[PDB]
Amino acid sequence: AWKEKIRKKLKNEIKKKGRKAVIAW
């Protein structure tokens, strides 16, 4: 999916890391 459209980290960390664009900034 996408971390479930985003949410498999749990939150997906909220999204990744938050998109990891929130880490990938």
The experimental method, as deposited, was NMR
Which of 3, 24, 25 has its CA nearest to residue 14? 3
Round the CA-based radius of gyration of the chain to a whole number and report it.
8
How many alpha carbons lie under 13 Å from residue 18 in its C-beta half-sphere? 5
Range of the domain at 21: 1-25
Q: Any idea what DSSP says for residue 7?
A: T
Our count of domains for the chain comes to 1
Inter-CA distances, 20 with 9, 16, Å: 12, 5
